[PDB]
Structure formats: structure tokens, C-alpha cells
From Swiss-Prot, chain A:
The modification N6-succinyllysine is found at residue 49. It comes from Oryctolagus cuniculus. GO terms for cellular component: cytosolic large ribosomal subunit. The keyword Ion transport does not apply. It comes from the Eukaryota. Component of the large ribosomal subunit. Transmembrane segments: none annotated. Keywords: Cytoplasm, Isopeptide bond, Phosphoprotein, Ribonucleoprotein, Ribosomal protein, Ubl conjugation. This is Large ribosomal subunit protein eL32.
Swiss-Prot record, chain D:
The modification N6-acetyllysine is found at residues 46, 54, 109. Belongs to the universal ribosomal protein uL15 family. Residues 1-36 are annotated as: Disordered. This is Large ribosomal subunit protein uL15. It comes from Oryctolagus cuniculus (Rabbit). Residues 1-29 have a biased composition (Basic residues). The modification Phosphoserine is found at residue 67.
Length: 128, 187, 53, 147
RNA sequence: AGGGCGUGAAACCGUUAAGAGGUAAACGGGUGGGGUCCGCGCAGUCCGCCCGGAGGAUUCAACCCGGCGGCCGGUCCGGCC
RNA sequence: UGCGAGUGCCUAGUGGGCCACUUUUGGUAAGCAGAACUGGCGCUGCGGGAUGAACCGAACGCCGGGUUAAGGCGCCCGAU
RNA sequence: UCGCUGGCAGUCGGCAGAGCGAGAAAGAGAGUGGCGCGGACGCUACGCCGCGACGAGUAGGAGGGCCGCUGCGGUGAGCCUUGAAGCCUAGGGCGCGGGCCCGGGUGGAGCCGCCGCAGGUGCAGAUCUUGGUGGUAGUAGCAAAUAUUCAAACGAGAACU
């Protein structure tokens, strides 16, 4: 059994789809990263019915459940074993991550030390 | 929908000092606590002035301070300046004074101490009188800066003694046509 | 074009001022050279005053 | 620092903050301060009266060294010497008067603006004004001229 | 890495697999279906205190010896600023 | 009856406008040219007018429930 | 978001005594006579907390970016041939967004976080510059000046030698 968080409230998200840039489907030169349209005659900017939506501030997530992984934990990036004693006291709320650059032999030691300290790791069997 | 306007909803006043002086921010913490947890408006005025910029807290002079402290009634009270106390060389006799100030120039300090006065920082003022009672709050002339004689009704407009922006003052610079009566007209 | 109240100025930048701009990047080198020459003169005139007559 | 200025916030806005109706053209009013008489007339009249025209004489070879004469005031008169001088002069009952030579300090003319403390002085200057002389007389003291 | 040979992107093309196809195609919102993978899913949480039962230890409170530390002496003595 | 006010600096863009009820000048008249008052469009999406810059209603953060405006309820198409 | 320019230094604990929301100013005032050793969280105050109202926007203005790129001073007893940068991905996620973090693969030598500093710092357009690649399309076309055929040889191979 994995390590459960202190509380697991029902996470509500106002929108699950991403905000794709207008006319990013038609061209390859236009990437899906959002850019606010600024054309004078642009129907997405003028918000005509049935067009692409825009990232309002109203879509913001509940502050109590923001940045929260589906398990109920908040991510934290770890590069070496010296920065797990940091999460030693943030035990039931924050999980850990091994940075992609860490080699296998150090990733091991990080994993056993986290297991000893009861800190949850979301990528515990990454490279092997 | 509601029929209102949003032009003036946001106030413009300062909420914190714009500066990063750590001693100033400690003073602000102390006086925030005092103003919140007391019922004296003196502390509110003091921190409001702590928030201000330099042009809004001009230097105060020994001459003004001595005159305003020898005004009748306010004997042996503590003068309080949220600015700077500068020295004034055109004053001869210095009385005994009890000043509290953010900073005092060296010669002003020498004059006051030799005359037998006492100079305080705002932490000592808070320790001595939390409500600031027995104090006379002063400030420097706020419109003494040279910038203010350039403001208001534009020069070259009837009945406006406004200083113009001239590169240099002399005989050949902006003195002929809107100034004389012979050269055209006079404003 | 003039704007709201301000000063009316006369920049002398209508010639070709950029083809002749004297920078001072060699100022420390010139100071070092001058003082080295000064010391050389002072020790070539052995007992005489350094500042001259 | 370019990090803090306005060009960084205008990336992505087409006109770079200069509008679209009236573009940012090159010199839409003439170079420099042209048209002072013609189409900037009311700016020049409204903020620079007297700018156009001539007045007064001409002086072909003017010498500021000839026209040089700094001034000092009776307020600042006692600052030109040490306060030891003033204290000893006030203390002394013989009646001796200290000599205040303003040419040594670097002033040529004495103008009398403010009060003067009740103490005799011999002021040794190059020029005097009538009011300064009367104030020095009133405090009780002499004005000696030097060349 | 096979002599214009480090890495080898996009536009474009070949083939394999999956899906689909009379209102050019593509797009937004809402579901549904099918896939590829993931959960290492497949009898499902623990954490304190107390009660009861079997256990096992050099074992508790108190007392004595030594060391260290924190606060005082209404006004202990001595320093330093 | 309602409402917190006063005051100072620095300042960008703009200086091609157009439409509608009532008033109104030229013209036979005009989706013509020129004015007055108010409101709009430009800068503005949304329900209705099948369709539409300015018409009628109503002005906008992301959502659940309820109720209405103008306009509608044979079928397209929600509602006799 | 704005306003209240609202609240919180009172975590005042056996040297203790748990309060400051309630219609109507101001003392949980001081004195003078007549056993068991115990009590959650909090407050990067540039933080945390509590009420109300509000949320259209071109030209333009301002603020915040723990958005992003390159380089310098500090700093992480930082990362790395047990695999850095770069690139690909029907893999898992976070953020309203700019973007970012993991997994897999390829690759083979360097790279990044935080505090400041600096700038030749973010592209969809400009009949933009340079390089490359499509549909058109196996299409247009290979038509000025009369003309070629048979046999053999060489040759891997002959309408053309
Ligand atoms: Mg438009
Ligand atoms: Mg609203
Ligand atoms: Mg608005
Ligand atoms: Mg405003
Ligand atoms: Mg301008
Ligand atoms: Mg804009
Ligand atoms: Mg501008
Ligand atoms: Mg343009
Ligand atoms: Mg213009
Ligand atoms: Mg124009
Ligand atoms: Mg210009
Ligand atoms: Mg290779
Ligand atoms: Mg290659
Ligand atoms: Mg393919
Ligand atoms: Mg197929
Ligand atoms: Mg008309
Ligand atoms: Mg326009
Ligand atoms: Mg408007
Ligand atoms: Mg509208
Ligand atoms: Mg119709
Ligand atoms: Mg509804
Ligand atoms: Mg209908
Ligand atoms: Mg808005
Ligand atoms: Mg190599
Ligand atoms: Mg560079
Ligand atoms: Mg580019
Ligand atoms: Mg491009
Ligand atoms: Mg062919
Ligand atoms: Mg053909
Ligand atoms: Mg031919």
C-alpha cells in the first residue's frame, strides 16, 4: 500500500482541455502555445459564438487543491539525498521527484533514503 | 448590469514605503503595530509620513523649529520631525531642545548638544511615549523646492508670475516680444 | 516638434560629429606613462630637485 | 537596464504603442524647433514669451573678470570668522571690536538683509550698501573701505 | 560514424499498422465507441490511547556520585563597556 | 433625495467619423449634401428581427438550480 | 480586483489562570480606614486571516510574472561517460496562461537552480532575406530546311557506331 496524504478532498477543475492558439490546426508554422490574438477583425478576440475560448482569470483553480497531484500530494524536485531531510517534516503533504539528470547509482540511494524517511516518490523505479 | 463607473475605485495612496532601507522597514513594523493597537492618531500620522517620499518630507531647519517651539504654551515638549533637521547658520542663540528625528546633520547635532538638548530616534520616542503625548509634530516647507515656481498658470498669460524654462538668464534670452510693450504686446 | 511646457534647446549635432569622437579609454595608460617618464627624469637628474628650478 | 524598460512589454502589440490611425512617421512637424513663427506659434507664445526679437545694447568684448563682484549678507557676516572670535569679543569688557575682512573670505560687496547681533564690528570690505551700512552703524561699529 | 562520413529537426515522400470516407477539408462545446499505454490495481487505509491474553528484557519510581546547561542573589563578590 | 471630498504634477492616443426618434436648410429625390438634442456603432460579445455594424431586449469572470425581457408555441425548431 | 488605508507581535502557561462581538463614552485597577508536571495549528509580517461590492473593451496607459533566451558576479560540499546538451514520443502530470516537471527512445561531453547584474532577448505576415521542399505533373513539350532500308562485324548490350 502506498503512502496516503493527510487529506484527500475532491479535486474540481474548471476545465480539462488546453487552450490552443487560434489557427494552430491549419499551419505547421503556428504552434499550439497560446498567443493572445490582437487582430482588428478577429472573431476569437471579439468572442463570437462557437469559436476558440480564451484563458480568463475565471478558470483559476481552487486554492486549497491547487498544484495538487491526483494522489493528493504536491511535487518537489530532488537532485541529491541532502534535500530529503527538507521533506522529512513536510511528510504528509509533499512528495519528491528525482531530477532527470541524476544517474542510476544515486537514484537508488535517494529511493532507499526516501523509503526510510516515509517520503513518497512518484518515480521510484525510473531507470533501474 | 450596474450603472456605475470604475474610474476612481482604486485609491492611489502608498501602502508601504517605496524604499528598501531595512532600518526604515523596522520602524514601519513598529509603528504599524502601534497605530493598529492604540487609539492615538499621532501614530497614524507618523507612519503615514514614514511611507512618504523625500519631496514629501522636506528638511526642517533649526530656525523654524526654534520659532515653533518658542510659540507660547508649548514649553518643554518634544519636537518631532519625520524628515531631516538641518543646521541654520543665520541663528545665534540655541535654546534647550528635545528633538526626535529620522536623521540630524552633524553640525545641527553639535549645536543642539552643546546647547544642552537631547536627540532621539523613533524607537526611543516609542519607548518614551507610545501615544506621542507631549509632542509637537512639525514638518518642513513642502513647496520650498525650486520646481514649484515653474508650476501653475503658464508663463506668457495675463497675470501669471510663473518662472519660464530658459537655458540661461541674460539680455538675449526670452525678453523681447511677449515681455515688452514696444516689441508687439505684453502678456 | 515642441510639446507642453519645456525648455527650447540647441544641440550642436548638425555637423558630422561621429567621424571624430575622442574617447578616453587610454587615460590610465597615459597616466602610467607620464609618471614613469617623470620617475625616469627624476632619477636621471640624480641630486637635483624633481620639480625643477 | 533594458530588462526594466517599456520595449519589453510591447512585444506582441502591433503598433508598439504609437497607434494605428496616425502611424509613427519620421518628422511630422519639421526638424528641431522649426515653425516657431508659423505652426508652433501658440506653443511658443504660451510657454516662451519674449523669445523672438531684440532688445538692449551690444557689448563686443565682454569680460566677466571685470564684471566680477560677489556679495555677502549681514546674516552670513559672522560666519566668516571662527565662533571663538565672537565668544571672546562678547565676553571681553574692554570694548575691542573684531575685524571682519570679507575680501579674505572671497566677497567684495556687503548687502544688509537680516538682523545683526548686538556686538561691535569693524567690517573691512570693498563696497557697501546704504542699508548694510546703517545696520552696522546701529549695532555700533565701523565700515572701512579697501581697494 | 562507410571517405561532403558528429548530432540529424520541419516542410515533402515510401512502406507497415489502426481507423474512416456521397455536402472540400479543418475547427469550438457535449458525450459515446474503439485503441495505445499507465495504475505495477485485482479482496484494500491506517494513526494514537485504553481493556483483555499469551510472551520477552537487567527494567521503572525513589536515593547516591560526577559532568553540563537555564534562571536567579530583595543589595554575594569581581570585572568590562 | 442621493453621495466621502479637495488639490498638484507628468502624460499617451486622438484631431477622416457613421447611424437612429423628434427639430431642420439645399435639392424633384436619393443608401444625397449640411446642422441642433439625446442615444448608439466605431471599441461589443449575447436573446429576437430567417439573413444584416448601428433595430427591439439586454450589456459579459468559470459554473449548478430557478425565473423572466423582446420575440414566440403546425413541422423544420424549444413551446398551445 | 478593489475597498474596509479591517484583524493578528497575546505562542501574555505551574514565575500559569486562558476574555475583549458587544445597542447606547470611559478600569477582569491597586491599595487606607470606617497528588498526577500537562496544554493542536500558527506569524516566509514583502506573511497569514476576515468581511462587503465588483469583473465588456480597439487606440493608449500602468502593475505582476516561481514566464522564456544569452552572458557576468555570487551561491547550491549542485548535476554528469552507471551518460550532459540537443532531438522524437498514441507515456504520467502541474499551471487560467506565458510555460514547466517526470517516463521511454536516440544521442556522446558538458549543464542547471537560487540571489543580484547586463543585453544584438521571444515572429505569421513586411510583393521581408537566405537555404530547402511540394501541387501543377510523369504534364507542357522534345514538329523550320523532302529520307531512309538491308546484311555483316565488334560488343554484355545496336533505330542511332
Ligand atoms: Mg471593427
Ligand atoms: Mg456584473
Ligand atoms: Mg471599464
Ligand atoms: Mg483610473
Ligand atoms: Mg506628441
Ligand atoms: Mg491593446
Ligand atoms: Mg505612446
Ligand atoms: Mg499599420
Ligand atoms: Mg501623429
Ligand atoms: Mg489622419
Ligand atoms: Mg519620432
Ligand atoms: Mg554517430
Ligand atoms: Mg550523419
Ligand atoms: Mg509515415
Ligand atoms: Mg489501410
Ligand atoms: Mg448626412
Ligand atoms: Mg477606426
Ligand atoms: Mg464606449
Ligand atoms: Mg452593443
Ligand atoms: Mg426580415
Ligand atoms: Mg442558468
Ligand atoms: Mg420562429
Ligand atoms: Mg477588463
Ligand atoms: Mg567526442
Ligand atoms: Mg550579446
Ligand atoms: Mg526566429
Ligand atoms: Mg517564419
Ligand atoms: Mg510520357
Ligand atoms: Mg505528352
Ligand atoms: Mg528543330
Amino acid at each position: 500500500a502506498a503512502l496516503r496524504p493527510l487529506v484527500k478532498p475532491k479535486i474540481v477543475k474548471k476545465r480539462t482541455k488546453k487552450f490552443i492558439r487560434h489557427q494552430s490546426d491549419r499551419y505547421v508554422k503556428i504552434k499550439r502555445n497560446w498567443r493572445k490574438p490582437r487582430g482588428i477583425d478577429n472573431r476569437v478576440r471579439r468572442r463570437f459564438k462557437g469559436q476558440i475560448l480564451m484563458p480568463n482569470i475565471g478558470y483559476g483553480s481552487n486554492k486549497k487543491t491547487k498544484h495538487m497531484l491526483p494522489s493528493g500530494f504536491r511535487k518537489f524536485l530532488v537532485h541529491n539525498v541532502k534535500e530529503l531531510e527538507v521533506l522529512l517534516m513536510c511528510n504528509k503533504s509533499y512528495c519528491a521527484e528525482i531530477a532527470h539528470n541524476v544517474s542510476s547509482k544515486n537514484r537508488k540511494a535517494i529511493v532507499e533514503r526516501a523509503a526510510q524517511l516515509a517520503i513518497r516518490v512518484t518515480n521510484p523505479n525510473a531507470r533501474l | 448590469g450596474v450603472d456605475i463607473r470604475h474610474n476612481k475605485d482604486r485609491k492611489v495612496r502608498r501602502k508601504e514605503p517605496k524604499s528598501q532601507d531595512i532600518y526604515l522597514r523596522l520602524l514601519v513594523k513598529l509603528y504599524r503595530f502601534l497605530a493598529r493597537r492604540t487609539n492615538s492618531t499621532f501614530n497614524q500620522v507618523v507612519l503615514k509620513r514614514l511611507f512618504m517620499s523625500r519631496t514629501n518630507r522636506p528638511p526642517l531647519s533649526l530656525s523654524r523649529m526654534i520659532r515653533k517651539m518658542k510659540l507660547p504654551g508649548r514649553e518643554n515638549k518634544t519636537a518631532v520631525v519625520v524628515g531631516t533637521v538641518t543646521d541654520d547658520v543665520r541663528v545665534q542663540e540655541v535654546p534647550k531642545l528635545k528633538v526626535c528625528a529620522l536623521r540630524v546633520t552633524s553640525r545641527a547635532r553639535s549645536r543642539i548638544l552643546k546647547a544642552g538638548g537631547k536627540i532621539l530616534t523613533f524607537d526611543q520616542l516609542a519607548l518614551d511615549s507610545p501615544k506621542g503625548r507631549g509632542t509637537v509634530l512639525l514638518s518642513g516647507p513642502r513647496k520650498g523646492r525650486e520646481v514649484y515656481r515653474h508650476f501653475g498658470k503658464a508663463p506668457g498669460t495675463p497675470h501669471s508670475h510663473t518662472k519660464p524654462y530658459v537655458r540661461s538668464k541674460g539680455r538675449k534670452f526670452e525678453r523681447a516680444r511677449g515681455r515688452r510693450a514696444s516689441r508687439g504686446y505684453k502678456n | 516638434a515642441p510639446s507642453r511646457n519645456g525648455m527650447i534647446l540647441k544641440p550642436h549635432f548638425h555637423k558630422d560629429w561621429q567621424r571624430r569622437v575622442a574617447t578616453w579609454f587610454n587615460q590610465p595608460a597615459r597616466k602610467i606613462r607620464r609618471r614613469k617618464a617623470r620617475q625616469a627624469r627624476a632619477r636621471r637628474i640624480a641630486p637635483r630637485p624633481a620639480a625643477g628650478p | 537596464p533594458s530588462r526594466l524598460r517599456k520595449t519589453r512589454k510591447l512585444r506582441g502589440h502591433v503598433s508598439h504603442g504609437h497607434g494605428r490611425i496616425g502611424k509613427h512617421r519620421k518628422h511630422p512637424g519639421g526638424r528641431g524647433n522649426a515653425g516657431g513663427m508659423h505652426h508652433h506659434r501658440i506653443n511658443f507664445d504660451k510657454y516662451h514669451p519674449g523669445y523672438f526679437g531684440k532688445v538692449g545694447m551690444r557689448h563686443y568684448h565682454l569680460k566677466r573678470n571685470q564684471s566680477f563682484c560677489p556679495t555677502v549678507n549681514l546674516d552670513k557676516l559672522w560666519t566668516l570668522v571662527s565662533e571663538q572670535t565672537r565668544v571672546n569679543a562678547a565676553k571681553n569688557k574692554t570694548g575691542a571690536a573684531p575685524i571682519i575682512d570679507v575680501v579674505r573670505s572671497g566677497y567684495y560687496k556687503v548687502l544688509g538683509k537680516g538682523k545683526l547681533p548686538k556686538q561691535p564690528v569693524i567690517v573691512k570690505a570693498k563696497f557697501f550698501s546704504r542699508r548694510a551700512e546703517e545696520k552696522i552703524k546701529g549695532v555700533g561699529g565701523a565700515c572701512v573701505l579697501v581697494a
